[PDB]
Ligand binder design. Sequence first.
Ligand SMILES: c1ccc2c(c1)[nH]c1ccccc12
Ligand SMILES: c1ccc2c(c1)[nH]c1ccccc12
Ligand code: FES
Ligand code: FES
Ligand code: FES
Ligand code: FES
Ligand code: FES
Ligand code: FES
Ligand SMILES: [Fe+2]
Ligand SMILES: [Fe+2]
Ligand SMILES: [Fe+2]
Lengths: 388, 389, 389, 104, 107, 104
Amino acid sequence: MANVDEAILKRVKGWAPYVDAKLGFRNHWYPVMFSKEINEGEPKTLKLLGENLLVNRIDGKLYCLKDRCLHRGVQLSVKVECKTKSTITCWYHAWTYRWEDGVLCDILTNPTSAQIGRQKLKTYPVQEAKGCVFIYLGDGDPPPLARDTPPNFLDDDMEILGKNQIIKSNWRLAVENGFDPSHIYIHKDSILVKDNDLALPLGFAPGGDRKQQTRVVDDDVVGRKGVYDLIGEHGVPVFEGTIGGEVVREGAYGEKIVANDISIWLPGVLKVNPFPNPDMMQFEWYVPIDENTHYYFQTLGKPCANDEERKKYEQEFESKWKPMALEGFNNDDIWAREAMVDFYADDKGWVNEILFESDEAIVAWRKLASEHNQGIQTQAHVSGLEHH
Amino acid sequence: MANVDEAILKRVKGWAPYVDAKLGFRNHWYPVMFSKEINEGEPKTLKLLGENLLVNRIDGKLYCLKDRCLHRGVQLSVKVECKTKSTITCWYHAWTYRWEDGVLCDILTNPTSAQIGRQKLKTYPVQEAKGCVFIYLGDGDPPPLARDTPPNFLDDDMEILGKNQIIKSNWRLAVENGFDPSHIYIHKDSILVKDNDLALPLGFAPGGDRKQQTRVVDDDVVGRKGVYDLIGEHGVPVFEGTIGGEVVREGAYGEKIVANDISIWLPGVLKVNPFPNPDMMQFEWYVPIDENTHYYFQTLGKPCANDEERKKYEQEFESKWKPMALEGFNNDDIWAREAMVDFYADDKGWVNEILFESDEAIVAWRKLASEHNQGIQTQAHVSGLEHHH
Amino acid sequence: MANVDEAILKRVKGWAPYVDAKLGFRNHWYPVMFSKEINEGEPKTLKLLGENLLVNRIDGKLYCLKDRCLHRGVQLSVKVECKTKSTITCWYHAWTYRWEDGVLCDILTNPTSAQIGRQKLKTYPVQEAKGCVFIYLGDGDPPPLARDTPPNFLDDDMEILGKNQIIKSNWRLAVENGFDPSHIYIHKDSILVKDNDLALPLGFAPGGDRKQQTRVVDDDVVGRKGVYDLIGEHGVPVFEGTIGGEVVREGAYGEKIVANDISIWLPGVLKVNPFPNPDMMQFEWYVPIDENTHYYFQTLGKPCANDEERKKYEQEFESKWKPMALEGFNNDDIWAREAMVDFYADDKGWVNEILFESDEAIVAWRKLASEHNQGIQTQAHVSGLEHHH
Amino acid sequence: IWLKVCAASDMQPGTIRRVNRVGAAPLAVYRVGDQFYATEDTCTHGIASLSEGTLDGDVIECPFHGGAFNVCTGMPASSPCTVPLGVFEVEVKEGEVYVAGEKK
Amino acid sequence: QIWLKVCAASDMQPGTIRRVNRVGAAPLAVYRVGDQFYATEDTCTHGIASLSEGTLDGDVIECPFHGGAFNVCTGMPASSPCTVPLGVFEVEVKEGEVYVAGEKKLE
Amino acid sequence: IWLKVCAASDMQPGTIRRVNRVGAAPLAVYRVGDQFYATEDTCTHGIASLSEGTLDGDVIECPFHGGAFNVCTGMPASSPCTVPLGVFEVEVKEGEVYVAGEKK
Ligand SMILES: c1ccc2c(c1)[nH]c1ccccc12
Ligand SMILES: c1ccc2c(c1)[nH]c1ccccc12
Ligand code: FES
Ligand code: FES
Ligand code: FES
Ligand code: FES
Ligand code: FES
Ligand code: FES
Ligand SMILES: [Fe+2]
Ligand SMILES: [Fe+2]
Ligand SMILES: [Fe+2]
């Protein structure tokens, strides 16, 4: 939908839609915060896919309104005026909207206005699952949340805990950094490696039967769409890094086996199993905020049968996992993403990049995302759709 | 003239020139500072309509030169060198200009140069009135200042006192907010309303036809161009704000009636009478500095027959009107203007805005501005007008 | 190639290549730091002609690799990893290159990769001379260093000392400010003038035989291309600055004669002789870093026959010449350069500038640079050259 | 039930005629060739008068922002318009055009 | 093992490409330009793309990944971002049968 | 007063000739077709010599910045030139070109 120079899109015939999706994919569910972060009657602002939104909790249920008055385009959040439980009144000329359907139900500055009941502020579906707030940034009735979530994230027994933050890089650079088989080289000195006695090679190199290591999923019953990188089951572990034949670096020879299988799913969520411990799983999203930033929504799952277990897990999370894994391990992924910004900033990195064997999995992802995304977000979606 | 995407200008047929006037209207007088701010032989810098200017006072009189040397385009003000009372010498290669006509009269580094007396630095007319400094940002002979000021501002007995500052929003957002009949809602909690017992509705339910909502003045004895907001003529003031039939807010039931008449005039000055008190008036300009900023030049006028009344007024102004009205009331206008920046920054809000009834006032202003402005300032006027045969 | 609006380039027929060379000229030697600034195994980063580079010293020799991994385009310098003495390993996926030829010799994350030995990271020749590090930002076998250095810089006894810094102005504004005969007016109050008893007029103006003051050099045996502004011998010294015929400022009447001859040479190095003392020379480069910044590479040369003289000169340099001349004199050149940024930033200044007689020297330079430069650096050179069959 | 607008002959094909009604919102009658259509005069995207716009075939373009509507269906034809225009019934009985007091 | 049997000359239409897989070695690409046959490595030198999956225009093969291109006769780059020459393998037709060399030309 | 410049045939069509004058600013004589015109030689926008510029019909283009003038009126034809050029009437008698001693 024209976000990139046409000359570049013409060059990347294998995945032009993906290269063009600088603002992300429209018509998909995206996690933006945790349930505990949004309280009853306290609207919270955020930007998703370039759009400013407002989220409010009313009678325990979440509602989402575009944070931009229909009148003069100001953000309602500049000065929040929720004068009745079910509505929000713009601070400027008092146009009032219902949280449930966005209908302009009243205008305090002119209760006789012909606009009343005849205009509607954009609303977006909101759903809470596993203590995470998901917003369907799309049009029409939303598909099942499961379609845009990795396998097992929604298991009844699966206890989800995590953290979220804003990172300065396009979402795609985050995705590819995460689903990259050979990038773990940057984690070779992470405190998680030693402090958790992990077995971690310098690089999971491509085995022989390539299409046996990569598994494209487009037959998932709930509609999921993604790609598996079967490094542990079909890939090769490089534990001794050599230069000129001499060993200059070694991987970690710990006892804990992790990262058996990695998978990337639309709209942009990675699943690492098992990780950071053999009895856990990591699910992380790279949510588009605008063309230069994304939410790095990290979650760790661990089956729990009772509160006593949930509490224990919650304690380990706070004292070990979050500090040693989400931060100790993944922090290097943050500046790694930032490091690729300049090369791709002008969109030319998508042409000049020189890929090697382990990037085969990334290429598969680009084609899958290009073929199965539910829409390309455009700046026009942000300012107001245009058509003659 | 070519400041906005041509496709957008094509869509706004009712006021394309106004939408294109991002840098403001050329060939109009604009206030930029108060007389007391510029002293004899003390050149002052400022940017107006995107142009860097220098103003100096010589023998009591003000002169304005473009703050850009003709030679290598540097600002003379980087290092001011006024070597004679009537000239200014560029700090770089010493090109020297007369404040009176901008003529390049000498070049210290080459007294025999053929450029001497053959080049001229742009000058603009400057006039002081009511303690305010106005600059005619235009070409050729200027029209009377009266043409570009609201009625009565220049009245002999009118005592003017004010405040000026730089605000971060395009000048038009400032103009529209000030003339916006329904924006009165943002002032509902102002300290002035309570502390000065003002009557202030939340808005108005329009009455009568479209034509009765405003009164356009296409010509004054001096050629003034403006529009009066007549929404209160047949409209019903709203004192009780309801949502779903329930009262959620009330206007202010004070005894003092102000803002009986509000008018906006080209090049962009609002007159509110009477305000903030029944016995005075407010005249405020939204002067274009560049595409993202303007001077919010506020003034309060009050008829004064002698020196005793003037002194008394100056005391009331400093101790009450300036802090309670100019700041206490208008500060909310400042962030409201800033709140509209994003929507109009890409020029698309001029197409996507959804107007309602009271906006008839703004529409009348956009059309009047489009039909009677004296010229559209372009980036080319700033860098140097362009033309190729 | 495609650096400036074609409409502007068409207007400056006399020196389009020069106006288009916003990023500098490719295929020339450029100094970027002093030798003592780069030690053994201490990788240093720098941006030259818009390209991020890495320089390292191995077994005493300097090597230069483009600071950009061939794989995903990250700067290797974000987390330098030199595993072996002769290589550098990208911190991302471990692609490993040799400093000597840039060849991708190993890949720790995949030793069986077909890319190994089949890719080559860009390398640039580097050579140290007079304690200065020069990088040939070009392709193919480099020409002799002497071609891109002013006469005498490489003399056997010429002892070179200096200072370097990053200045916020395009390199061309720096070049023209330096080779400008009338700009010394900005140096009239420099401490160097009095503190070193210099004779310095307010400006050297055009003598009588124009073609005779400027000397275009394109017949030098070493191939260097430049222009001399023969001020001392053919130029006229202006000591009495007048406005309306009245003396308002005078130059300096010191005994020390300096700046007899000034010359600018490609790729952009000025030679002032003698300066800042009758027995010294000043050689300064304005090295393009990106379109908005440059290295102001200052050097002062003074014959020294032995270590005792060199040590003496070094002490004089630190106690006098550096603080009094390089800083005390040229500091004004810095803000002068910065003052021209706005006028030329949009590339319009190259059309709207109003030149006078002394700029004749600058015009000659613009033409010579346009005709003898060895290549126009473009954004494509920075991102990766493009070409469709 | 119906109101007299004008004689079908007073309107050239491709022209618009505003119909002001006492005590109610104005309507716009369009003649697209030989057929006459009617919608409310006020653009649903704001407060502009469509009768002051430009008619191109059976599509009316608003003068304010360039939004457009199909005068036959009242459905939006060009952004920024999104809210259907109210359509009124028209009848040409005896060379005279009449418009329904209420919208179909 | 010096010459590899690919297919019958008639099995290939002008302007088409065929990939030749080899045990223990990188794949090759055979191109038919008119009635002439040429061959190079199948893997684009700029990455991991298969040129046999690209578009042939005359004697120039265009890579499907980034649009780079090569001259199939010389193996030299024809379009950016390609900069590394492809190895070229001699092709000969013996009795209407296409054969591609097992070793690339030296130079 | 009049200055004998040269023979008409000394100049090919569409060419410019610089005429130096001791103690005075040089002039430029332009041959447009078979007609002749004269102006000051120095561009009013700088130090460029119009005689080293490009003549397009009756408009001379400065070699420095693309500014231009109409050699007949001397008025600016293209920016950045804004100051009118000095014009000098010219007469051709007996195949000899003469230019007015002073501007007029
Ligand atoms: C390979 C091995 C481990 C990981 C990976 C790729 N990507 C990841 C993202 C988050 C946490 C762990 C990993
Ligand atoms: C004229 C006279 C002196 C100088 C000059 C131009 N340009 C210079 C640059 C550095 C130091 C001295 C000079
Ligand atoms: S901008 Fe919100 S009610 Fe006017
Ligand atoms: S820039 Fe002012 S005299 Fe040169
Ligand atoms: S970006 Fe350097 S090895 Fe991958
Ligand atoms: S008011 Fe008609 S398109 Fe906006
Ligand atoms: S892999 Fe062939 S052009 Fe990049
Ligand atoms: S010197 Fe002639 S156009 Fe500038
Ligand atoms: Fe990672
Ligand atoms: Fe206000
Ligand atoms: Fe200087």
